[PDB]
């Protein structure tokens, strides 16, 4: 699972979920990609579950790129306690995704398997998404 | 007290004019310094008490 080596500040405010993506909205490395259509926090566990779904489908050949990193932490206070007395300890790492952002990428010789492999991964993410190509 | 309070008295009229602090480990001796004395009306040598 993707985890940053270190962060200056361990307890942070929630990332804002307004607006569309400014950068990262085009496919740069591979030939096919997955473009988001909704706001969400993509946890580092849904990325691992979504890039193993691509690996199983294409088997041997091809390359996969992950363009988003789970940097920003979210806290969770101990169970069954009243409100107050501090802020909870961090538990999971998320990535702030806005509509238009391209999440994954793939290079594979044939198209039918490539579009099927990327569909297997949209079903693991908590948002709607679509498959985009390098062409205009 | 490392830095105790000390009082500087004029040599001539012996009036106590000023009070300050000095480190008694760095400066084990009585501080000697020239300061203005209102009674004498001029700058006179002052010494710690």
């Amino acid at each position: 699972m993707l985890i940053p080596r270190k962060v200056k500040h361990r307890k942070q405010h929630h990332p804002e979920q307004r607006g569309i993506a400014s950068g990262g909205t085009s496919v740069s490395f591979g030939d096919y990609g997955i473009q988001a259509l909704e706001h969400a926090y993509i946890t580092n566990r849904q990325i691992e579950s979504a890039r193993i779904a691509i690996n199983r489908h294409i088997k041997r050949g091809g390359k996969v790129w992950i363009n988003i990193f789970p940097d920003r932490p979210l806290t969770k206070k101990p169970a069954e306690t009243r409100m107050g007395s501090g802020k909870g300890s961090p538990e999971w790492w998320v990535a702030n995704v806005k509509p238009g952002r391209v999440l994954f990428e793939l290079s594979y010789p044939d198209e039918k398997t490539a579009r099927d492999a990327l569909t297997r991964a949209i079903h693991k993410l908590p948002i709607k998404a679509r498959i985009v190509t390098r062409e205009e | 007290d490392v830095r105790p309070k000390i009082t500087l008295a004029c040599e001539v009229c012996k009036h106590r004019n000023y009070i300050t602090k000095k480190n008694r480990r760095n400066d084990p001796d009585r501080l000697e310094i020239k300061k203005f004395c209102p009674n004498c009306g001029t700058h006179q040598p002052h010494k710690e008490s």
Binding site: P78, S85, G86, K87 | -
Partner: protein
């Protein structure tokens, strides 16, 4: 469990007291600041804690001199 935070200090009310165009007397405080974000100009002096005060009556004017922000006092003319 508890929190080890919870301290703070009183707000020091810094900022600019007289803005551009205001007519001031002599010795009147213009800017309260920590460093020299603004530098003294003509007829303006710097206090002990980097306060800027007027050295002569006039109207405040902000300028720049070699990339340095300065505060100047211009002598409004008698009727």
């Amino acid at each position: 469990s508890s929190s080890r935070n919870g301290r703070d200090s009183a707000a020091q009310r810094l900022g600019v007291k007289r803005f551009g165009g205001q007519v001031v007397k002599a010795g009147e405080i213009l800017v309260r600041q920590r460093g020299t974000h603004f530098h003294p100009g003509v007829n303006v002096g710097r206090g002990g804690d980097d306060t800027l005060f007027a050295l002569a009556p006039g109207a405040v004017e902000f300028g720049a001199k070699r990339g340095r922000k300065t505060v100047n006092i211009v002598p409004v003319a008698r009727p």
